[PDB]
Write a protein that binds this ligand. Sequence first.
Ligand SMILES: *C(=O)C(CC)(CC)C(=O)Nc1cc(C(=O)OC)cc(C(=O)N2CCN(Cc3ccc(Br)cc3)CC2)c1
Ligand SMILES: *C(=O)C(CC)(CC)C(=O)Nc1cc(C(=O)OC)cc(C(=O)N2CCN(Cc3ccc(Br)cc3)CC2)c1
Lengths: 815, 805
Amino acid sequence: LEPFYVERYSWSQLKKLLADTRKYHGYMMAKAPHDFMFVKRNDPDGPHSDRIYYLAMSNRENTLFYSEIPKTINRAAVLMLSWKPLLDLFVGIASYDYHQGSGTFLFQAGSGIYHVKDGGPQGFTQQPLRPNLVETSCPNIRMDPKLCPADPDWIAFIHSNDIWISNIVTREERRLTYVHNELANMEEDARSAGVATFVLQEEFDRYSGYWWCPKAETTPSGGKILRILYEENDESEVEIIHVTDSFRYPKTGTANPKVTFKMSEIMIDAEGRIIDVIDKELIQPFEILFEGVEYIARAGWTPEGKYAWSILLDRSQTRLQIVLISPELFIPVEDDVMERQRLIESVPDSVTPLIIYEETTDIWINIHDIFHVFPQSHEEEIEFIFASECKTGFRHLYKITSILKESKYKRSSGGLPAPSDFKCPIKEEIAITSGEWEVLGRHGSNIQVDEVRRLVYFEGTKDSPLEHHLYVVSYVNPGEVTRLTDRGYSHSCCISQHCDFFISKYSNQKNPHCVSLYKLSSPEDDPTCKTKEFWATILDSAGPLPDYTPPEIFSFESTTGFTLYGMLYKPHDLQPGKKYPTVLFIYGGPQVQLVNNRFKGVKYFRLNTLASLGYVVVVIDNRGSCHRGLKFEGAFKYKMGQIEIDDQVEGLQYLASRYDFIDLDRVGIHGWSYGGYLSLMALMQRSDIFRVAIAGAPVTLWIFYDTGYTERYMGHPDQNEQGYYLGSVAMQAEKFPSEPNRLLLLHGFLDENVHFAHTSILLSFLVRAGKPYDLQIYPQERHSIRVPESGEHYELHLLHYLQENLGSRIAALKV
Amino acid sequence: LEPFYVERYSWSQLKKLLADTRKMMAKAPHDFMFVKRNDPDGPHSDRIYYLAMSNRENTLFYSEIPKTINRAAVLMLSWKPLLDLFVGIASYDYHQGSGTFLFQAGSGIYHVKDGGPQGFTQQPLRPNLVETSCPNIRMDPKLCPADPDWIAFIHSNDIWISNIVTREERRLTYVHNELANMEEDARSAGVATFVLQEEFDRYSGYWWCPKAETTPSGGKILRILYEENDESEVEIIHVTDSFRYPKTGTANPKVTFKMSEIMIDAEGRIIDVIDKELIQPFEILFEGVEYIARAGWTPEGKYAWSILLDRSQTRLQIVLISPELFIPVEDDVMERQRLIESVPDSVTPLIIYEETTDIWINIHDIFHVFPQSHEEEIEFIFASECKTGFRHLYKITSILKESKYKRSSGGLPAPSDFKCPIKEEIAITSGEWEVLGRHGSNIQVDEVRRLVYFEGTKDSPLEHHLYVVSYVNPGEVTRLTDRGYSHSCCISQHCDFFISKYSNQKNPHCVSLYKLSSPEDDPTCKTKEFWATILDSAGPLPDYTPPEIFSFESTTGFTLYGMLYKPHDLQPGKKYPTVLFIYGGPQVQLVNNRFKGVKYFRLNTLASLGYVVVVIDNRGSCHRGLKFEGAFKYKMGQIEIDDQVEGLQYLASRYDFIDLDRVGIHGWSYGGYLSLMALMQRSDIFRVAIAGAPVTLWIFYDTGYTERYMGHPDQNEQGYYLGSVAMQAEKFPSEPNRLLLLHGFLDENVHFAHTSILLSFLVRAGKPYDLQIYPQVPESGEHYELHLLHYLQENLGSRIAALKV
Ligand SMILES: *C(=O)C(CC)(CC)C(=O)Nc1cc(C(=O)OC)cc(C(=O)N2CCN(Cc3ccc(Br)cc3)CC2)c1
Ligand SMILES: *C(=O)C(CC)(CC)C(=O)Nc1cc(C(=O)OC)cc(C(=O)N2CCN(Cc3ccc(Br)cc3)CC2)c1
């Protein structure tokens, strides 16, 4: 079998070749319609059932569109919905709030907060609407604006890490919290109000830190009380890091912010003006009420506003509690310590945190966005749907009834609560779903509960670990699960709040993403049984790209007892009796799955380019990758970096003994982030297999990464001395090759997740160890390769590097 | 004519070749001082004290100079340690009258006594810590010449004084607070700021008045002149803490002179300190003046002096400043208004010297002031390039006229209002060669025989020599050091001995003592006699082949010198890959008759491998006069590479072993710059450029350096553009393996900023580059030399290098 050698292009040729095949994209394309809302027309004589509002790009601003849903279609034809701009514009909108009662939209668009009215009592527009600025006196950019659901004249926003409110009719503006000072330096002033800190945004996808009570409590006076639950964070003890401003980064094994809950009680007169603002604090400290809690993972309100709820995690992230928090647990902030004593005694001992759910695992808690509270029908019971892996090892929906009874803990006795004094008994716990597959609850995946038909819609892997599908099941007598989406695609969906329509954004390997609307119905005889009919296209496919050759999906029966899936890009113009150089592309880390039946043409296009130059490309989902349950994810607990390259090599050898065109003496490996890490691990542990590793923004030292990620997967470094040692490439610089042109590092200097520090400390230990390395730095742009200028130079340098040191004739003659 | 191909070594083999051949060096005796023994009966004339490294502490030694020698033998002086030790001393202070030494060593300021009226020790002395309550490091300690019980030092950027007999300690300035950060508080007293340390080699910012004035009571007044500096307006920059860096075209600090008047009773205790300030702000008195380049006192402390430069560094002034120009710092403007009006209007600054150039002023350490023979005259020696374009000694008499201008007339002074009439201005030296005044080079003045000893390039621009000349009837210049060595000397304060440290290409550095004599008939004539060795040459290094010095007449009208390292085991009919080593910037000369086997040892290693190493001092380099230096004014980056190429063609048409198709270029700092400029401008000549810590963008560099050679940026947008490689990324090649950048992350004057910004623009332009970073040392240097040899082999030298293209 004769080696194939990639045509040795020049840097000028390779630049032009890249510039010609990039007639589209910048690692992403126009954002597909998203954040759908369904509003009923309610016109007996009109042709349209519903108006749908969404965000999309028509290089254009992300903004708000609507489309008309007709009552009936030509079932012969295909209706392409037309996009009607909602807004007049003379940046972008990333999200929006809506109040159905009033038809009020609220959204940030650059520095400005705007509002417009559509779909309420005032009716439906046939023309773009003028966004109305919410006038402010605040000097700095306002962030994270939200309508009071109890009263849509009122909004809240954040300004210099404090919570403010503003009335969009009266223009009254009022600061609620006094915890931060913009003029003091972030070394001195490290307290915030209503803002998710770094680890909760980066490692748990919680972006908001305050929650409006959805109901107003009327006064005797004809006024009302509006309420805001908010987290308050003291980041003083937290490590600072400087990146050519500063910021607060809890490094593994170091302090997370000090956290509590607070309650702002806002009194309004009959005319809608502020009488008073009372800031309120927990009757006892957070550490006393919620013992062992590190992380406030999610929070909000019960539907009637009777309770705040939170999902609370311990530091090890192996204990999850759901807790109800009555607003009566909060008392005014009071400086007079006798007056404060009187406020403490004034609240009954019967008023206590209510742990309505608690679970533990020896692997990890994966936080998700699934939690639905049914209307209370009795004061002593709450009924809710939650999702959990902790019962069977696959994430399933459970319908739970918890009993809300008095604690044995009486605060009057002057003692401190015992570890389970707030545990609620479970009256009932029922599995709504089960089996060797998972319900999705992350990255837009959620449930829609139909409380009239007693159904829940959910997305899952039931049909295949390689496609997300939409499903419905009864939550009252769980039996039959109906798949609502069609096989041969992966679906990302949402359901109308009215439960008579669903939208799917779907793709496969051959076919770019499309977005289509589906009507839902019931056979006249059984409202429980659900059928779908096609209604309309929102976004048409481009169809198979004229140049792009999709990969093939393969699987192998691993010795570890799991099926492993992979993608294979056969080289273009394959020849008999020639074996081609192989690039393995890897992520390999938790919470990600590369191999599924979706279009890889937008973001992984250049794996096709590589194939067009004469490289075999391989991608494998090693143990630890997601959508295969907690046991499969749990393989590397404490052992990150130890098992991943085994699976990669096993799959590569599987492919090699099946296809003689794979040249095992010319394997390169390339990844970003966790994939950068495994590229380094691969060259270090298996220099026999891998000729070259290109490591992009690698983790090189687990103690330099953050609390929320590394402790979930690796525990505390005191309890895993060898895991941290073996897992940390920088601690093992002496195991790298002593021959150059095998190791290439790539990093941006201003990277905010994986710091340049990882590359720079690796470089220090490579230098002390007398080891060669190549380096490409993207000096600015923070996103480094996401920004096209840095990205095109990366693609270019990468293609040349593989040509010079793996692919070409010269490369062979260099060794 | 066949190509030669360097052996292709593995990484591991190059590391071995490098560790085997490897095996700064110990610092040679320096900071010499001669003390007479005055013992008619004893065998010694003088004790000398000096600092030296015996991998040891730099510390204080003495040796004994005998009254006679055995002329048949060679005397090696023995090094006797002055200090009883079980960090380093960088410098020391001494007071002849008391025999008191003062030196910092680490955290501690210390003192001992020797050679005073207590006499000479025969055994090491215990250093005496000056006790302090100051929480932080004390800096820059100095004996009060008037009273050796009194020292000064800097703590948290204020001037303190302390008494080594009484234990009395006192803060003199309250200009900075340490519990407050540095973005708020940018005020310092007695401390030279970043640009004067780095660009003018001024390290102290306060100066003891050398005489004490008596108080009627039997007490006295000590004085300290000092610069006060406000860096508020000056730009801040950070590296992985932060500092005040005057970027070119932006704010230099606000500067004044201040005077601390210290009052002591008969028993040596402080009665009071009055801080005093200029009677009219610095800008009023010192029109046009950006930098305080140098300051000090006349020998009897009547006037303070300063050498003042304008921002463009083309106007130099020497100024006498009477302590009578300073008045107490007063809150209440009523009480203030008498102090102002009382000071006579006759008391004015006296500009005793002024000069101007269309190139630039080179600041130096030569300034000697004679005793005041007459109240209306000052007599001094200064050195200047400003007449002939070569640095020469001048004897000047300036008349100290009452100024035309009056301060009671509520007026503002005109420019020439403080100028002093030049009575007399006699050239002591002249010719197409320069007196040296920088980096230790200075004069010693013999006031009894009316002689001045000085160092110069009279004999060759390749060798520094010691010379002596009369300053009264300047005539014959006598060279005192021997041809075939470059010398760095100091002269005894008694003008009867000198010490030379000298080396040449073959011979590592050596330090010898020479007795000076006069024949009885003519005290004015000088002879020298070898007296003793202080530091023996290592002897020739046993596997170092020195380079040869070549020259060439050049189309620019100047002789240009270079070093040529021939390939070892040279073969006939084989042309060899060529490496150009370069600095090329101002204030440096690489090419001279000195030992190169310590710093440039690896030039010889490159030659051993089969490379032709070449070094060339282009126009802009030093020791060749101001016109030669001036060739690149406004034009840095534009002319240097012509000279390098010219010299390479010269060698190529004279020697056929030079393969012009395989030329590499390598330098650091300004050398890194010219390395990029060379691949940018002349890719036809240079296959590969290896730039270490390069300047890539002149707006990124500081005031004191870049505005001297390139002007304010506003009036040279074109020169700043054409000399900034970061503003010209598109001109680099579009094949890789030709451009290698090396930079320390934590680099202090050539910030990584230069490298990242060039990378940022290389990426914009879709151009390839190799990079090595050294994030925090011998380990780094080892890796660089290995990475360098490997890079040259793989991309210039070897067989595979020529296949690759
Ligand atoms: C790791 O997870 C990091 C590395 C920068 C940082 C935490 C990361 O976020 N990677 C990453 C992020 C985005 C993004 O969309 O940010 C908003 C995009 C990309 C990305 O586009 N890449 C780089 C290129 N990879 C495919 C590829 C292979 C070969 C060739 Br020649 C070109 C392109 C896809 C991942 C990364
Ligand atoms: C430039 O002027 C800078 C760059 C770091 C300052 C910004 C500089 O100071 N250069 C420089 C300074 C010293 C020094 O005196 O520090 C105590 C030393 C050196 C130095 O290391 N070099 C560079 C290597 N040189 C020749 C060489 C050629 C080939 C090989 Br394989 C090895 C060595 C000797 C001097 C730089």
